[PDB]
Amino acid sequence: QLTEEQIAEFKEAFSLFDKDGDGTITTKELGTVMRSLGQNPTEAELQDMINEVDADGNGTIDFPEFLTMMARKMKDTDSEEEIREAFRVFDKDGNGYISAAELRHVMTNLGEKLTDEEVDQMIREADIDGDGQVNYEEFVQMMTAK
Amino acid sequence: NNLVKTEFTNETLDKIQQTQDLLKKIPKDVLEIYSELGGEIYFTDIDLVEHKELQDLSEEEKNSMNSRGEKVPFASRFVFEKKRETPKLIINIKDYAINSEQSKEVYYEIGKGISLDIISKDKSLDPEFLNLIKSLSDDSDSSDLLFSQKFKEKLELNNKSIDINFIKENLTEFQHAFSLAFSYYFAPDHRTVLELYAPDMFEYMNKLEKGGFEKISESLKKEGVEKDRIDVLKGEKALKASGLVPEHADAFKKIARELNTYILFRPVNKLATNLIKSGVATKGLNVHGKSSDWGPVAGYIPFDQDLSKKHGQQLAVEKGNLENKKSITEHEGEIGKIPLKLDHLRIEELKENGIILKGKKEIDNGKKYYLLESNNQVYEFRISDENNEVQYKTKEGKITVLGEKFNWRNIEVMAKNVEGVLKPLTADYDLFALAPSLTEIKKQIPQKEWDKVVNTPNSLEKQKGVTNLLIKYGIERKPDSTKGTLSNWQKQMLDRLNEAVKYTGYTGGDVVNHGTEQDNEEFPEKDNEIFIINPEGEFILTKNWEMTGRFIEKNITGKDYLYYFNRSYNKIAPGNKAYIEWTDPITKAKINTIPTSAEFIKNLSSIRRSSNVGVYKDSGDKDEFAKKESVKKIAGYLSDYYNSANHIFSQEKKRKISIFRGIQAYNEIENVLKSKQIAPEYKNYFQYLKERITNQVQLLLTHQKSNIEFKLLYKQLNFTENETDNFEVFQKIID
Ligand SMILES: [Ca+2]
Ligand SMILES: [Ca+2]
Ligand SMILES: [Mg+2]
Numbered sequence: 001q002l003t004e005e006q007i008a009e010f011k012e013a014f015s016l017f018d019k020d021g022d023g024t025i026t027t028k029e030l031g032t033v034m035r036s037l038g039q040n041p042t043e044a045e046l047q048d049m050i051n052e053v054d055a056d057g058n059g060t061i062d063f064p065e066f067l068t069m070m071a072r073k074m075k076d077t078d079s080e081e082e083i084r085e086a087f088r089v090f091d092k093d094g095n096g097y098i099s100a101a102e103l104r105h106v107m108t109n110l111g112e113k114l115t116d117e118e119v120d121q122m123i124r125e126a127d128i129d130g131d132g133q134v135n136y137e138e139f140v141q142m143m144t145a146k
Numbered sequence: 147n148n149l150v151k152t153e154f155t156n157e158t159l160d161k162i163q164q165t166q167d168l169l170k171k172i173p174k175d176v177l178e179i180y181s182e183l184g185g186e187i188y189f190t191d192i193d194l195v196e197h198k199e200l201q202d203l204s205e206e207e208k209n210s211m212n213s214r215g216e217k218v219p220f221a222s223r224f225v226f227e228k229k230r231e232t233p234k235l236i237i238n239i240k241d242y243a244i245n246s247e248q249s250k251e252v253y254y255e256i257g258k259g260i261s262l263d264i265i266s267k268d269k270s271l272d273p274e275f276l277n278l279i280k281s282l283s284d285d286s287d288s289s290d291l292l293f294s295q296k297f298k299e300k301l302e303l304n305n306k307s308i309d310i311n312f313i314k315e316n317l318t319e320f321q322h323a324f325s326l327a328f329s330y331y332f333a334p335d336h337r338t339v340l341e342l343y344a345p346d347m348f349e350y351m352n353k354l355e356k357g358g359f360e361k362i363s364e365s366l367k368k369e370g371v372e373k374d375r376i377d378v379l380k381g382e383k384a385l386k387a388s389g390l391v392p393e394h395a396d397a398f399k400k401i402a403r404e405l406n407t408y409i410l411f412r413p414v415n416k417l418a419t420n421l422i423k424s425g426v427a428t429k430g431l432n433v434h435g436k437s438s439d440w441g442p443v444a445g446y447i448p449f450d451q452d453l454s455k456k457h458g459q460q461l462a463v464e465k466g467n468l469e470n471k472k473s474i475t476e477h478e479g480e481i482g483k484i485p486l487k488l489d490h491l492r493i494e495e496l497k498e499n500g501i502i503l504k505g506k507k508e509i510d511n512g513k514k515y516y517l518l519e520s521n522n523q524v525y526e527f528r529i530s531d532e533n534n535e536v537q538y539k540t541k542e543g544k545i546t547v548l549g550e551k552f553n554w555r556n557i558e559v560m561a562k563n564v565e566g567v568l569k570p571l572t573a574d575y576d577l578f579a580l581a582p583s584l585t586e587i588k589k590q591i592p593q594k595e596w597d598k599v600v601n602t603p604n605s606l607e608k609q610k611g612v613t614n615l616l617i618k619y620g621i622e623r624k625p626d627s628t629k630g631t632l633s634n635w636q637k638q639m640l641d642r643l644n645e646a647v648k649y650t651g652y653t654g655g656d657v658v659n660h661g662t663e664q665d666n667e668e669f670p671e672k673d674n675e676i677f678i679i680n681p682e683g684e685f686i687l688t689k690n691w692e693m694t695g696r697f698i699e700k701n702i703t704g705k706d707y708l709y710y711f712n713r714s715y716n717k718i719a720p721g722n723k724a725y726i727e728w729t730d731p732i733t734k735a736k737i738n739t740i741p742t743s744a745e746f747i748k749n750l751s752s753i754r755r756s757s758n759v760g761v762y763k764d765s766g767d768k769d770e771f772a773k774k775e776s777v778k779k780i781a782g783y784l785s786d787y788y789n790s791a792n793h794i795f796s797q798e799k800k801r802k803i804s805i806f807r808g809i810q811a812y813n814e815i816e817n818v819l820k821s822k823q824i825a826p827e828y829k830n831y832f833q834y835l836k837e838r839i840t841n842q843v844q845l846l847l848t849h850q851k852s853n854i855e856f857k858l859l860y861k862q863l864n865f866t867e868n869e870t871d872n873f874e875v876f877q878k879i880i881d
Binding site: 004005008009011012013015016017035036037038079081082083084085086087088089090091092093094095096097103106107109110111112118121122124125126127128129130131132135136137138141142143145 | 584585587588596600605606608609610612613614615616617618621622699703704706708710713729730731732733734735736739742743744747748750751752754755760761774777778781782785787788789790792793797798799800801802804845846849
């Protein structure tokens with residue numbers, strides 16, 4: 001049972017992406033909603049979803065057919081927190097930023113041996129904006145995005 | 147801390163290639179002592195006089211005793227040690243000249259000496275017998291009464307053997323010695339003039355170079371930390387406000403070591419510290435009754451709430467009782483009530499502590515009742531003789547707030563099943579937190595998994611694979627039917643915590659019942675004084691909510707121990723609707739981060755349910771839709787910002803394309819911000835939602851080519867109809 005704070009969001013989820021004006025959205029755009037809300041769900045996984053909870057022909061979704069469909073994926077990926085704490089863990093110094101120094105400095109303690117060459121390879125690939133350090137946002141992506 | 151500061155690199159090497167010469171001469175450690183005493187050495191240009199940025203009025207010539215010999219013509223000086231607090235040695239050089247006559251450089255040493263010396267050993271620890279005895283090369287030990295180098299105008303007093311009878315008096319005098327000695331043992335030229343004449347001071351400065359200089363350089367290094375430090379109270383001085391029971395804390399001591407993890411406890415009211423040692427079990431989850439600190443029942447969860455702290459609070463007590471009743475109703479056979487039986491010792495304790503007074507006695511239906519007295523004004527108390535049950539009633543001239551009036555009854559208290567026997571209840575050990583070393587969590591993962599993870603090709607998958615492991619086997623907390631909400635290891639620790647205070651002499655069950663207050667997301671509390679027990683066994687009690695924070699950041703967070711904080715900390719805990727505060731790194735780095743798609747959409751959603759006016763209304767005004775359409779556009783640039791493909795580009799590019807993507811978003815915000823009447827609340831937001839973009843791009847910029855300022859770079863752009871060349875432009879703009 002998604003809280004209300006948890007609902008007002010999914011509201012301005014449809015709301016924003018609706019150039020038709022009912023409170024009903026299509027496939028192409030149901031994706032767009034979640035994606036922006038924060039998920040990369042396979043163009044394959046959207047099919048049976050919209051294919052089961054709405055064989056109503058149309059190929060759309062009233063807020064209900066959504067408010068529900070969502071209070072489904074809102075369970076195991078409840079990692080939003082675990083993940084934000086993994087983050088604070090590596091951020092060994094408090095600068096809100098993870099640096100290869102600390103990446104290595106902890107990858108090691110957990111018994112992992114990393115090459116000064118490889119840590120600078122993770123960080124890099126994990127940094128989206130170039131500063132040369134992963135931030136929570138960059139981190140959150142790195143983690144969840146499969 | 148860099149010891150030497152060369153002010154003017156004015157001359158060529160010659161100046162430099164002289165200062166260097168000067169230093170390498172002086173003993174590497176002498177410096178490490180100087181830098182340790184927070185000193186700094188100044189080599190400036192021709193500022194001879196009072197011109198040094200640090201040569202003005204602080205602590206100057208008050209009593210003239212300056213060089214080796216005594217002159218004092220300041221103006222004619224090229225070396226000076228700023229006496230008072232930090233040692234600040236300042237020097238300078240003119241043309242090429244220290245070489246030929248070293249009778250000049252010899253002052254950069256005494257001129258130095260005054261530095262360490264007085265806190266070097268002469269009077270470093272105190273006059274240490276080592277230097278106190280060495281200062282006796284006056285004319286006793288050696289047939290060498292030849293010290294006409296340092297003892298002329300101050301020690302022609304060969305007629306007064308020097309020791310604790312005198313040496314104090316003119317310490318400074320005995321400094322000039324440590325100086326001209328140091329100057330001599332080190333002067334570039336005369337090294338033996340010391341070794342020749344004074345036969346000990348040589349073997350002294352000499353021992354100093356042996357390691358004597360590494361000595362103080364280490365009694366100071368260590369002092370370095372413990373001096374300026376986190377004011378706590380390690381040792382039995384805290385274990386006293388710790389409330390814990392010494393045999394227990396001391397018991398816990400074995401665990402923090404074996405497993406190496408910080409153990410933090412909240413305050414266990416003093417009043418039940420002994421009630422514990424005494425075998426009284428502890429309140430767990432099942433009970434929610436209130437404790438109490440006055441009268442006989444003290445430290446127990448009096449079935450009667452008007453007999454606990456909240457004495458008077460009608461509704462608190464009215465609901466207080468309401469809670470024990472259910473405590474039993476729902477968890478029967480395990481929770482209930484049993485008569486209060488103050489044992490032997492306990493009675494003598496509630497006396498020196500002043501909780502109760504034992505006086506007049508009396509005879510009722512054949513039994514001896516001492517009569518326990520307490521200054522309460524509605525309840526009188528008496529304790530049997532046969533057994534020590536306790537009793538109270540309403541004084542013939544008072545009543546019970548809830549509107550009750552009763553005659554002599556036994557004081558019932560709460561108690562739980564333990565080896566099948568309802569034992570009275572009292573304060574338990576509520577852990578504030580558990581910090582196992584990061585390396586211990588490792589020993590929590592099953593080799594086959596952590597194995598099957600690192601043997602991965604994907605470096606970035608490797609990290610994940612790891613983090614999840616670290617998350618799973620170490621950060622994750624599940625809710626339990628018994629122990630509140632906690633981690634599996636947290637649990638195991640919980641058991642070892644108890645079986646620890648059981649193989650000692652506890653016969654009341656467990657003393658640590660639930661998980662760490664860090665999961666008390668519902669009704670989180672804020673205690674000033676927190677008891678910790680490092681992986682070393684030292685006891686510690688913070689004093690502030692901050693100190694605790696500060697501590698944990700220095701010895702836990704900052705160090706290599708895994709820790710996490712009450713998800714409710716900077717937020718607003720529902721249950722008690724309380725707001726705590728705990729420094730969160732992520733947040734401290736928000737002012738500089740373009741928000742995400744969802745963080746935005748989220749924020750909007752917030753205000754929408756706060757005012758009842760959204761960024762855009764469900765109407766026909768084509769100026770509304772203009773807006774809606776427009777936020778959907780912001781929720782793109784921002785979403786475009788954080789793109790994963792961003793890897794297929796080189797670092798520098800990333801910064802750039804991102805900086806643009808940013809400006810992108812920013813702009814369109816500026817846009818709406820200039821639209822129709824968008825509620826003044828979103829007005830602010832969108833504005834702060836700029837501050838960030840701004841700040842963020844500044845970063846991404848001063849990260850590579852930082853001459854341009856966000857303000858500027860923006861002006862130079864053309865966000866009219868054509869975007870194409872706009873970027874092509876922007877590029878050069880940063881080149
Ligand atoms: Ca960091
Ligand atoms: Ca970054
Ligand atoms: Mg408790």
